[PDB]
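User: Here's a protein and a ligand (BNI). What would the complex look like?
Assistant: Let me lay out the input and then the predicted complex.
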Amino acid sequence: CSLTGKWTNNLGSIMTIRAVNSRGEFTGTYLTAVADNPGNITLSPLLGIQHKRASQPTFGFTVHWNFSESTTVFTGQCFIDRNGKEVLKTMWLLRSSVNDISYDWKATLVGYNNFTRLS
Amino acid sequence: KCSLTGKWTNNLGSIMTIRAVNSRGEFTGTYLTAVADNPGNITLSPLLGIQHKRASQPTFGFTVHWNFSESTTVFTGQCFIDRNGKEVLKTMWLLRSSVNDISYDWKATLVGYNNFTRLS
Amino acid sequence: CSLTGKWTNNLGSIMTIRAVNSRGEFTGTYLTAVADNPGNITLSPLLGIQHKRASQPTFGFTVHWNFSESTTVFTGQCFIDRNGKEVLKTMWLLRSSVNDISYDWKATLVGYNNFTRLS
Amino acid sequence: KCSLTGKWTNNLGSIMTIRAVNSRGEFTGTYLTAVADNPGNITLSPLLGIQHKRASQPTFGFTVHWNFSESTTVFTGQCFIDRNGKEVLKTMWLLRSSVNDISYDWKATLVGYNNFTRLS
Ligand SMILES: O=C(CCCC[C@@H]1SC[C@@H]2NC(=O)N[C@@H]21)Nc1ccc([N+](=O)[O-])cc1
Ligand SMILES: O=C(CCCC[C@@H]1SC[C@@H]2NC(=O)N[C@@H]21)Nc1ccc([N+](=O)[O-])cc1
Ligand SMILES: O=C(CCCC[C@@H]1SC[C@@H]2NC(=O)N[C@@H]21)Nc1ccc([N+](=O)[O-])cc1
Ligand SMILES: O=C(CCCC[C@@H]1SC[C@@H]2NC(=O)N[C@@H]21)Nc1ccc([N+](=O)[O-])cc1
């Protein structure tokens, strides 16, 4: 269950993840299929850490959107079924930029995503 | 302006130390949690994240790989600067526990908040 | 998109909801397919409110688990597709009972559920 | 023991009033939020929920049907009593916005926290 490779989720987004180093750290690139303003979407870098020893590791990563002031974090676990098929089960928080601390209450969206490997 | 570099404490008493933020907004550091499911096992743990660079009050996210647990936490939030120049990180977090198989996935994710201010 | 009726979700849970009154309030009964201790599962009452005027209303409800000290809240929206098929898209928070306020940080689980009508 | 009956204020300044808790733990009341997406539209709004009855520090949940918005909020939490008998509600919430169709569902749910103490 190395996060290295190419993935798609239930919203149609795709991400590519590079080699996971000995500390479990990885970089990659995220293409979201959806956005507040979808006409603005550009490829956005991600940076995260997975656990290394576990066969079905937990992990987290941050996506710095390159077309928005927002940021998303994803966390989840990679599972392997009896046929060797991998799924990333994740939850996410999406932080929007607000003007000052008095607007903080409305700044964080939550959701889920299930990822599978592209071919 | 708001750079996450430096030492911070939160409302639970945890301490984190963030190193240099690079020109992409990437940063690393360490996180010493005050609380855990098994606090007798707590050890200093690494974090890795990204903040926005241009904004004076940037949003950001980071991941903490706990070195004593199979779990992982992610934090996201915004750094605010008030009229006196005091900085606060307002964050929300998700903590993913390791479960045995996908049938237990539903119970694997905790949610919460944390407010951080600077040590010094 | 009246919540009245019989529903199942992606985890295999089922719920039955009674008549929605003029204020949008409803009661019902929830049978979860999963629990921390599944051998203890019993039917549990729910109580909530939906919006009335909207064709695709938002709503919320609370489930008082009758076999646990925990409580779950669900919120979401009822959608109708081109064929007239309804789906409840929901997110939930599950509050566990902890001993004192110093344990509060670990007391709230989050997740999703998609519900469809039973037949 | 902890009955949600009475008036409470939260960290955002909102006020809610909970009526009698029945023998099932069900309660109704009203919620006056201090903040909204469009605060010029705020009106007093009804809530309905259930708490546990036997526990001295019960968990609970409630739904607020905003009377001025198509959105709905749910809150869940626990009532704690400290060594001096002071009560605090520690809660987390989800706020569901109304979106036009299912393709926008992903952006429809906000999350947050609130801490409540008694008015009086
Ligand atoms: O649009 C944005 C930036 C792109 C976010 C894509 C999200 S990441 C969670 C989910 N999973 C995906 O694969 N893609 C979506 N930011 C944003 C979105 C909504 C709002 N809003 O106010 O609703 C503000 C900023
Ligand atoms: O205990 C752990 C690892 C350490 C988590 C510390 C959390 S990070 C969010 C919050 N903010 C802090 O500063 N500290 C806390 N993992 C864990 C926790 C609970 C459960 N559980 O099942 O409840 C399983 C694993
Ligand atoms: O087990 C319980 C009570 C039953 C909860 C069922 C949940 S409601 C969200 C989800 N959707 C469903 O249809 N069913 C599940 N409470 C509980 C669960 C886990 C923990 N825990 O610590 O992990 C503590 C209490
Ligand atoms: O504004 C609204 C309706 C009022 C919500 C008040 C929230 S309930 C959680 C928090 N605790 C409080 O005491 N008050 C706040 N709905 C709404 C809000 C934001 C958005 N949005 O898109 O950001 C859409 C609808």
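Summary: Chain B is about 0% helix and 50% strand.
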